[PDB]
Scaffold this active site. Structure first.
Site, mmCIF file in Angstrom:
data_model
loop_
_atom_site.group_PDB
_atom_site.id
_atom_site.type_symbol
_atom_site.label_atom_id
_atom_site.label_comp_id
_atom_site.label_asym_id
_atom_site.label_seq_id
_atom_site.Cartn_x
_atom_site.Cartn_y
_atom_site.Cartn_z
ATOM 1 N N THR A 64 18.203 23.737 -24.606
ATOM 2 C CA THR A 64 16.840 23.214 -24.606
ATOM 3 C C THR A 64 16.266 23.045 -23.197
ATOM 4 O OG1 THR A 64 16.279 22.074 -26.667
ATOM 5 C CG2 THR A 64 15.998 20.828 -24.622
ATOM 6 N N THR A 65 14.974 23.283 -23.039
ATOM 7 C CA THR A 65 14.380 23.131 -21.713
ATOM 8 C C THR A 65 13.930 21.689 -21.419
ATOM 9 O OG1 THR A 65 12.219 23.627 -20.659
ATOM 10 C CG2 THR A 65 12.750 24.821 -22.728
#
Lengths: 233, 241, 243, 198, 242, 237, 235, 102, 250
Positions: free
Chosen positions: F24-25
């Site tokens: 995930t960013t």
């Protein structure tokens, strides 16, 4: 590329994957199905037990952890025994030292951190069990899903084990019905039993087949087996 | 410290290190035990790499554990010392706390226990030794003979053999040992023991040795010449067409 | 997968591949450094390269203050660099507490070299991929430069250089001393020794420097300090009006 | 106070040990045997602190017996006593020392001599023609200084003890309920089991 | 070939799976739970006529109300038996009562877990899993007569009837047909003997087969040869008219 | 792991990075008197209780931590971080400076690249706060390497997020406000979801500002969260 | 320390193999003493033979060893054997019986064969000693922890050739002087050198020291080997 | 020197009848000549139909009652919810106390 | 964390070799040549001070080290290994001997102690052998002067004269030709200077050569006066100046 990279947990693959952890996850896939779901007043575990023979016991898959907490397993039973025992101790520590019942959310964090250590230590193995944790505490009802990778998520409902995908499908669609079953234990159990059905080529869950647990607003975590679950078949 | 697991299962359910330990036993010189009516007899052999030895000072194959029980072995000599030492200590410790010498069966269970433990401990290999243990229980006259092996298994035998070509001699003993009529005397019991050894050893020269255990801590070894009296009286006697 | 390529055991030719690779690692940051001794000071210079625009430049350093008197510059990746930095600080404080005087620059180099020697000999430890240059004005020895590497080797220097262009910078400096006939920069201000150091860095690398392309540490009697961009600019100005 | 006497004649060693065991205001036993056989030709007698006394003796016995079976050989009285001494000497400086005094009497088959060793709880060893532990020594030492001869027979040695016991039955405050007498010679250890009503 | 407690891509523990293979090579053991008792029966299986058959201990007492039959590498069962006896006697000490059969089994299954090369726990002192399955039979006031299968995995199952050993597949199928909730102890005894006679690779006599049972009233008794031989006589007779 | 490959690099660390790139960013934005942390939370299922699976973690009372990669590894790191913060406070009375905290995680993470018996961490961690002299933002890679940042991003959408941040930095040399960076973080998280958009996502933001939170770490709840989610939605239509 | 499919101990076999290349040592037992003879591995003119020892070591006053294998591995075992003798003497005020010290050393060796994962010692010993229970005794121990007693025995290089020759010329009623002679004879024929010179030899005897009824240990000086080499027709 | 013990007064009384039992105590808690509390109960329902009182040093009393309550809890966990009989409690309590013999 | 290689990294191969010890000896082969020569009234150890760039200060590198006032060492092979062996050797001369007997160890025994340290690296878990060979030159009242060589295996042997390292084969021969048991110290220095001339490629002067003697006691190198029963250390490092003076008359 998948060769000398699955020896132990202390090794990453060139893709960035930890294979031993993935293989531990796999022991779940081939475990008997279990379901969890909660409203605002109660939380329910329904576990279909699996027998080795017609002459045998369906082996127990629900362990009580405190008066306000407990869990259901899928995968290695002994691993469920280690983790739930650790959870029993933690719950118990919170009671003796602080006169405080342990928050379900903290129980999740604790399980996560315990599982994590086994994804990083040499000569150790990841736990090979998935766990569904229901609880009632100071912020209401809670369902948690534990993965031996260390990943824990809080949910309205879910299922793990063999063909769990069908039960999780049904629960995704039944959402606004079951979440509203407040102050009515037996309609929540029924909603859970109905959920576990969408995962049975098998058969028609029977008397020895079924195991139900509930915790809630004025209901300590209680397990029902055989006789008392018949009125749900 | 070091605790890398050495004894592990193979896909067919065999523990190969325990298995190869048995191979080392079948590699070692022969030992035979036969129990009579009022006795038990042990018998061994010696090899031939060299023969400029001094035998006053070289370890005999029958070992005294306590005054009433003896242990013989096939396999690695070095390993056997470690079992003999431990067995000897336990026998003293039993007297010290139970106020009674060990029963033959108890001593066996102990030695088998030690062997078993070395099959499931990190960074140790099993004993390349299998033992015959024989004697009489304190204040008892019924003869006792037992066998342990590298796996930790043990059991009692009317007669039994271990080590190289024990296949052959167990064949003999299976025909020649009558359950009904044990070799009734000390003499006729040593007889069966020498016979069963003969076809494996060659000549009973500087190889065949014998030990006799009677009740109440009565254990005597034979002399080369007293052995030869059985060698002579069996070779020429059992030769007739 | 040959074991003598993975752990520090000898190869058939008596070689330690991990140490060799640890050396290879020291050039990873594509930074050259050099150190020189003045009359009463010691100067270290190192290229400073901030590629990413998102970085805060003031946190990007490879020079370290170990004690009041000793400074260190590392060639090699920053995690290893910092590990060695934390340790040298620990050792320098411990020495003073136990022995009652400041750990001399050369003794810290020796201690650091021995530590590295251990990773060279023990199997569970990987060497650190770094070369550590230590500088001070020792109270007994005067201006000092001592340099350690992943093999556990260390020696004192008249001057030295480290990095991808190590060889060019060295022969450049070798050449200066050959001509000057002495073993130091005969210059009473440290400002001029810095100016000298930068000048020979320029000539040997074939590059001009702005104030943010460099990092300067100076060691004077009883202080080691690093320069700010502005004290560096004033050094860069002075070299322009001459060279 | 506990009488532990030893007298070495020409061909044998004779140990006499009191038979009473007394806790507080009661004599609990009148026939206690304050002795352990260490080997066929080595006998040890002991007195001292209630618990330690028998535990130490038996611990020594098990060790000597163990050694015997390991080497198929009997250690000499001298070797046995040095072991016993070293054990006590370690003990004296540990957390809770054994409070046990001993006499070791043996016959050395290699030398053909009888040997008597006196060792106190501190690990002080000495070879003597005659010995005692406790208060009894304050009487017997001077009595034997007079009547003892180095070249006496076993039978004469038993008369010397009869005198020693008599003297102790006359002048010691406590009733030690007679003595058990044992002879160690070339044959071994036997009990002269008729000394009290003799 | 990399570690002890390592997972296969199928998510099984290699060493545990191979331990089960060792148990398949073991001598057959059969348990039948009734409401008049639990019967345990084993195949002695001597490796030679000269072996004194009654020195073969494959049915052991754990406590007066609990007994145990084994199968596989039987030397491994010594320390489990020892642990079980301690657990039961200890429990009686702390609680002045009899340990529940389930609790006793659970304790033995905990022992089974303690394998691994210095594996992260508290601590695992054992290099491999056990090579022996156990059938644990007993009675207690609460859950009545009971039978348990304890695998070296640490898992245990409760059974009405169970067979472990080389003849287990044949014996299990037979048990499925023959078992009903009204089997009397005398019937159960005959059934064990019958099913053992089918799967024994000798002719079933009183020397190569051992019977035992546990009744609430008399505890755990091993049957001596004469009592077995009578039942064996009597099985042959019962299976002649039919 | 204790193994250099022949190029001088560390192949186990290299593979750890792959695990991070796969996550995930999450981002950090420094502003004139604080820092702002934001993260993408993939909605696996409708069954996730919204807002109830918190990813951002506090250290002490003034440090924020967010991470991409193996979530359990991140939690392990924060636990260590918290012991490191208590140990410092206990001995030195003052709460831990952010630079000091950076090196504490730095050294611990780096230790796990030293021995063949351990694996490196499968996370890049973005963290920071307000201490005795200013706001600080840090990013720390599986290798142990860390630096101060004006803006930082890690995870699947790190390239698109890094590009956005570069834009802000260049177009705001006078510094950004805490209130602004909160909205911009929301924008940037929406604009890294592009490279991960087969699943739905939940936005989570925290901040630490001298004026806006008294230099304490706090979550952006209610109005201020909704205002940010709006600003982000607006600049995509 | 692991088994082979055949039931042999890999490292042990290879350790013995290692020893088979070491300079030969010989032990010969007589009615009135014991001879120890050892050959040094291919040497040089500049190698100091005076202040040199490498193959013959004194254990106590009644016991010496001859070494075949790794010198430094051997010094480890020599020193702990020296200590075991001293513990025994302190405990019992009697010198350690020869067999007992030998059993202890052999037990240590055996250890590295069963546990620990460390490599066995690359050493074989010939023990020469005297005690008052068995008199003169000659023993052999190798890396497997095995020990046996001998009238005459050889260890190290060329034990096959050595054993044939000793078995040929040895007789029970030999005096020490004949044993010394046989020791040199054997070595003369087994050497990998042109001839047998004095500087390639170590030599020791355990005798009943002429007149005293007491036991003497003689480690032959360079000159004394040179002497004993002359009267036996080797110059 | 530091004395680890105190005396909080305090009297308890147990009487057994045919099909019932009573355990009673006063509610006063004291130190020397002072009253700490007039209502501090010291007789506790411990579950499984067992009542318990540990009178004397109140800190030690509480510690003991706490541990027996925990003992009851773990007995349920370890022994399939079995009811802990009074005799079994008694014995378990001997062990709790004797663990601190010194 | 923790050590996880608790097994020997040096093991016997089928042929009977110990590979890691051989490979250490190959490492010693590449080492810069060093030598020792024993006179009737002294010992000389000497080696080359191979510089890497003339920016390096060769004087700061000790290749010839004092172990005790009467004992010294020099090496061929891996410099960093030698440096840690020197420090352990000095400490052990104290812990094992001086703190017990109030005097320094004789040469053979210190040599034995170094050998022990090297042997243990040959057998302990998780280690490689030391990649050095040492020459140790000492004097003690009861043994006089001696020279020893210690190899990676832990083996040690006494030499009248020897050389180890790169040009060892060539130099052992050169010495064999030149050694007799009647040499004065100054003669052995001269021979050592000659032998060392064959090895070096580049410059051959007092700043590229390190050379130490064990000779007579130097009272002026003691630091104090007033106890007539020590006349100082027998170990002396020859100065750059003193080496050059013996070079012009070479």
């Amino acid at each position: 590329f998948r060769n000398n990279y699955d020896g132990d947990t202390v090794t990453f693959s060139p893709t960035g994957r930890l294979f031993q952890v993935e293989y531990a996850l796999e022991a779940i896939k081939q475990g008997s199905v279990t379901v969890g779901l909660r409203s605002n007043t109660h939380a329910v575990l329904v576990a279909l037990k699996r027998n080795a023979d017609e002459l045998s016991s369906y082996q127990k898959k629900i362990i009580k952890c405190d008066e306000h907490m407990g869990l259901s397993l899928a995968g290695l039973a002994p691993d469920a025994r280690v983790l739930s025992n650790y959870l029993r101790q933690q719950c118990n520590y919170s009671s003796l030292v602080f006169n405080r019942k342990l928050a379900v959310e903290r129980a999740g964090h604790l399980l996560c951190d315990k599982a994590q250590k086994n994804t990083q230590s040499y000569g150790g193995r990841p736990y090979g069990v998935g766990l569904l944790i229901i609880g009632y505490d100071k912020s209401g009802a809670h369902l948690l899903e534990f993965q031996p990778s260390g990943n824990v998520t809080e949910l309205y409902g879910t299922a793990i084990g063999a063909r769990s995908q069908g039960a999780k499908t049904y629960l995704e669609r039944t959402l606004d019905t079951f979440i509203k079953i407040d102050g009515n234990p037996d309609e929540l159990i029924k909603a859970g039993v109905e959920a576990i059905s969408q995962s049975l080529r098998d058969e028609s869950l029977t008397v020895d087949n079924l195991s139900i647990a509930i915790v809630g607003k004025d209901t300590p975590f209680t397990i029902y087996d055989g006789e008392a679950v018949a009125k749900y078949i | 410290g070091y605790d890398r697991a050495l004894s592990i299962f193979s896909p067919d359910g065999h523990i190969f290190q325990v298995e190869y330990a048995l191979e080392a036993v079948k590699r070692g010189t022969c030992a035979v035990g036969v129990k009579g009516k009022n006795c038990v007899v042990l018998g061994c052999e010696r090899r031939s790499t060299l023969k400029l030895q001094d035998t006053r000072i070289t370890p005999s194959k029958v070992s005294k554990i306590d005054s009433h029980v003896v242990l013989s072995f096939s396999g690695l000599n070095a390993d056997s010392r470690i079992l003999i030492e431990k067995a000897r200590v336990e026998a003293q410790s039993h007297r010290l706390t139970l106020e009674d010498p060990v029963t033959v069966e108890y001593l066996t269970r102990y030695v088998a226990g030690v062997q078993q433990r070395y099959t499931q401990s990190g960074g140790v290999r099993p004993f390349g030794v299998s033992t015959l243990i024989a004697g009489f229980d304190p204040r008892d006259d019924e003869p006792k003979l037992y066998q342990t092996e590298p796996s930790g298994i043990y059991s009692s035998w009317s007669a039994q053999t271990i080590g190289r070509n024990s296949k052959t001699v167990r064949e003999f003993l299976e025909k020649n040992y009558d359950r009904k009529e044990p070799p009734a005397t000390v003499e006729e019991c040593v007889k069966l023991t020498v016979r069963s050894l003969l076809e494996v050893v060659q000549t009973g020269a500087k190889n065949i040795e014998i030990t006799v255990v009677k009740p109440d801590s009565d254990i005597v070894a034979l002399s080369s010449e007293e052995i030869n009296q059985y060698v002579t009286q069996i070779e020429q006697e059992k030769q007739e067409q | 997968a040959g074991y003598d390529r993975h752990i520090t055991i000898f190869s058939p030719e008596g070689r330690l591949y991990q140490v060799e690779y640890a050396f290879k690692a020291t050039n990873q940051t594509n930074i050259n450094s050099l150190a020189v001794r003045g009359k009463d000071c010691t100067v270290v210079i190192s290229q400073k390269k901030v590629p990413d625009k998102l970085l805060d430049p003031t946190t990007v350093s490879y020079i370290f203050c170990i004690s009041r008197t000793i400074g260190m510059v590392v060639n090699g990746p920053i995690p290893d660099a910092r590990n060695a930095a934390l340790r040298a600080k620990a050792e320098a404080a411990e020495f003073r507490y136990k022995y009652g005087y400041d750990m001399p620059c050369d003794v810290l180099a020796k201690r650091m070299a021995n530590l590295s020697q251990i990773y060279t000999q023990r199997a569970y430890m990987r060497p650190l991929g770094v070369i550590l240059t230590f500088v001070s004005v020792d109270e007994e020895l005067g201006p000092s430069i001592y340099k350690t590497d992943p093999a556990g080797y260390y020696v004192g220097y008249k001057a030295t250089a480290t990095g991808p262009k190590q060889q060019e910078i060295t022969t450049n400096l070798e050449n200066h001393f050959k001509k000057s006939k002495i073993d130091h920069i005969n210059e009473e201000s440290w400002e001029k020794v810095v100016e000298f150091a930068i000048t020979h860095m320029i000539d040997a690398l074939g590059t001009e420097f702005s104030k943010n392309d460099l990092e300067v540490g100076v060691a004077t009697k009883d202080k080691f300090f690093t320069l700010s961009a502005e004290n560096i600019e004033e050094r860069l100005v002075a070299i322009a009006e001459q060279d | 106070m506990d009488i532990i006497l030893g007298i070495r004649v020409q061909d044998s060693v004779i140990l006499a040990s009191s038979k009473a065991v007394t806790r507080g205001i009661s004599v609990l036993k009148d026939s206690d045997d304050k002795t352990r056989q260490l080997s066929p030709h080595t006998l040890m007698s002991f007195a001292g602190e209630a618990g330690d006394t028998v535990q130490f003796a038996e611990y020594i016995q098990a060790n000597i017996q163990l050694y015997s079976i390991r080497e198929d050989y009997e250690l000499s009285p001298q070797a046995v006593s040095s072991f016993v001494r070293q054990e006590l000497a370690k003990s004296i400086r540990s957390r809770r020392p054994y409070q046990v005094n001993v006499l070791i009497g043996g016959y050395d088959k290699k030398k053909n001599k009888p040997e008597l060793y006196q060792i106190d709880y501190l690990g002080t060893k000495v070879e003597l023609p005659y010995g005692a532990h406790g208060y009894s020594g304050f009487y017997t030492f001077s009595l034997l200084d007079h009547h003892y001869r180095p070249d006496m027979t076993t039978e004469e040695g038993l008369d010397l003890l009869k005198l020693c016991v008599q003297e102790l039955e006359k002048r010691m405050p406590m009733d030690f309920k007679g003595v058990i007498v044992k002879i160690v010679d070339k044959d071994g250890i036997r009990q002269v089991d008729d000394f009290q009503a003799q | 070939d990399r570690g002890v407690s390592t997972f296969s891509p199928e998510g099984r523990l290699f060493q545990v799976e191979y331990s089960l293979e060792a148990i398949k090579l073991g001598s057959t053991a059969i348990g039948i739970a009734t409401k008049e008792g639990v019967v345990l029966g084993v195949e002695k299986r001597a490796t030679s006529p000269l072996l004194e058959s009654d020195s073969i201990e494959k049915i052991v007492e754990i406590d007066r109300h609990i007994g145990c039959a084994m199968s596989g590498l039987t030397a491994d069962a010594r320390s489990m038996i020892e642990h079980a006896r301690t657990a039961a006697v200890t429990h009686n000490l702390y609680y002045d009562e009899d340990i529940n059969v389930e609790s006793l089994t659970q304790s033995v299954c905990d022992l089974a877990l303690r394998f691994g090369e210095g594996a992260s726990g508290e601590e695992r002192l054992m290099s491999r899993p056990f090579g022996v399955a156990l059938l644990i039979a007993g009675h207690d006031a609460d859950d009545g007569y009971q039978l348990f299968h304890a695998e070296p995995s640490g898992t245990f199952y409760r059974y009405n009837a169970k067979a472990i050993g080389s003849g287990s597949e044949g014996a299990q199928a037979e048990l499925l047909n023959e078992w009903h909730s009204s089997l009397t102890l005398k019937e159960a005894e005959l059934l064990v003997l019958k099913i053992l006679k089918q799967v024994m690779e000798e002719k079933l006599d009183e020397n190569n087969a051992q019977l035992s049972c546990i009744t609430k009233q008399d505890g755990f008794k091993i049957y001596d040869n004469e009592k077995t031989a009578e039942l064996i006589k009597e099985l042959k007779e019962k299976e002649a008219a039919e | 792991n204790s193994v250099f490959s022949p190029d001088g690099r560390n192949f186990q660390v290299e593979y750890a990075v792959k695990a991070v790139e796969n996550g995930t960013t999450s981002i950090g934005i420094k502003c004139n008197d604080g820092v702002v942390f934001a993260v993408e939370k993939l909605i696996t299922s409708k069954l996730l209780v919204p807002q109830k699976n918190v990813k951002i973690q506090v250290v002490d009372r003034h440090i924020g931590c967010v991470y991409s990669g193996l979530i359990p590894d991140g939690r392990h790191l924060v636990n260590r971080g918290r012991e490191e913060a208590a140990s410092f406070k206990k001995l030195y009375k003052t709460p831990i400076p952010i630079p000091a905290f950076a090196d504490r995680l730095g050294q611990y993470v780096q230790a796990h690249t030293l021995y063949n018996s351990v694996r490196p961490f499968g996370v890049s961690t973005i963290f920071g706060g307000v201490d005795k002299n200013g706001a600080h933002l840090y990013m720390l890679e599986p290798s142990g390497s860390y630096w101060g940042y004006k803006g930082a991003a890690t995870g699947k959408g790190r390239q698109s997020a890094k590009a956005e941040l570069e834009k802000l930095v260049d177009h705001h040399p006078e510094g950004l406000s805490a209130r602004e960076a909160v909205k911009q973080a929301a924008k940037i998280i929406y604009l890294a979801h592009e490279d991960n958009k087969e699943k739905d996502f939940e936005l989570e933001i925290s901040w630490c500002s001298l004026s806006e939170t008294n230099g304490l770490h706090k979550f952006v709840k209610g109005d201020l969260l909704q205002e940010a989610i709006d600003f982000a939605q607006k600049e995509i239509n | 320390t692991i088994f082979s499919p055949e039931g042999r101990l890999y490292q042990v076999e290879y350790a013995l193999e290692s020893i088979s290349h070491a300079g030969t040592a010989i032990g010969i037992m007589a009615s009135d003493g014991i001879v120890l003879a050892a050959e040094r591995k291919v040497t040089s003119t500049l190698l100091e033979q005076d202040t040199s020892t490498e193959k013959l070591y004194k254990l106590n006053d009644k016991i010496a060893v001859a070494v075949a294998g790794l010198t430094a591995d051997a010094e480890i075992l020599i020193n702990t054997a020296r200590i075991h003798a001293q513990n025994y003497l302190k405990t019992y005020n009697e010198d350690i019986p020869v067999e007992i010290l030998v059993r202890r050393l052999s037990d240590i060796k055996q250890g590295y064969t069963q546990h620990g994962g460390l490599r066995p010692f690359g050493v074989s010993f010939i023990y020469a000693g005297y005690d008052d229970r068995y008199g003169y005794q000659l023993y052999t121990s190798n890396p497997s922890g095995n020990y046996t007693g001998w009238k005459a025995i050889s260890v190290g290089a060329n034990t096959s050739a050595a054993q044939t020759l000793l078995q040929m010329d040895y007789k029970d009623d030999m005096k020490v002087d004949d044993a010394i002679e046989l020791a040199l004879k054997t070595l003369s024929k087994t050497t990998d050198s042109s001839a047998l010179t004095y500087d390639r030899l170590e030599f020791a005897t355990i005798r009943k020291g002429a007149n005293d009824g007491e036991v003497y240990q003689k480690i032959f000086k360079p000159q004394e080997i040179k002497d004993i080499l002359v009267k036996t027709g080797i110059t | 020197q530091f004395n680890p013990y105190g005396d909080n007064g305090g009297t308890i009384l147990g009487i057994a009848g045919e099909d019932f039992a009573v355990l009673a105590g006063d509610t006063r808690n004291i130190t020397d000549y002072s009253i700490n509390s007039r209502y501090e109960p010291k007789v506790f329902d411990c579950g499984d139909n067992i009542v318990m009182s540990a009178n004397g040093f109140a800190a030690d009393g509480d510690a003991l009652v706490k541990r027996f309550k925990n003992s009851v809890k773990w007995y349920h966990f370890d022994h399939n919810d079995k009811k802990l009989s009074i005799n079994s409690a008694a014995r378990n309590i001997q062990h709790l106390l004797y663990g601190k013999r010194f | 964390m923790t050590d996880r290689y608790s097994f020997s990294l040096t093991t016997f191969s089928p042929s009977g070799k110990l590979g890691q010890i051989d490979y250490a000896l190959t490492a010693v082969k590449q080492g810069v040549t060093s030598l020792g020569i024993k006179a009737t009234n002294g010992v000389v150890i000497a080696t080359e001070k191979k510089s890497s760039s003339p920016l390096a200060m060769s004087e700061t590198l000790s290749k010839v080290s004092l172990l005790t006032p009467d004992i010294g060492a020099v090496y061929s092979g891996m410099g960093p290994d030698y440096r840690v062996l020197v420090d352990k050797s000095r400490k052990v001369a104290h812990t094992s001997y001086k703190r017990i007997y109030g005097e320094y160890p004789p040469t053979k025994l210190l040599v034995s102690e170094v050998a022990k340290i090297m042997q243990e690296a040959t057998q302990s878990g998780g280690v490689r052998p030391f990649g050095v060979s040492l020459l140790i030159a000492g004097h003690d009242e009861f043994n006089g002067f001696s020279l020893y060589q210690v190899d990676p295996s832990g083996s040690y042997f006494p030499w009248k004269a020897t050389a180890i390292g790169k040009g060892s084969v060539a130099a052992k021969t050169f010495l064999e030709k030149r050694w007799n048991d009647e040499l004065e110290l100054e003669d052995a220095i001269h021979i050592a200077l000659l032998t060392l001339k064959e090895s070096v490629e580049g410059e051959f002067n007092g700043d590229t050569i390190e050379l130490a003697i064990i000779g007579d006691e130097n009272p002026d190198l003691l630091g104090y006066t007033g106890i007539p029963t020590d006349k100082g250390p027998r170990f002396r490092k020859l100065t750059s100046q003193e080496i050059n003076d013996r070079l012009e008359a070479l």
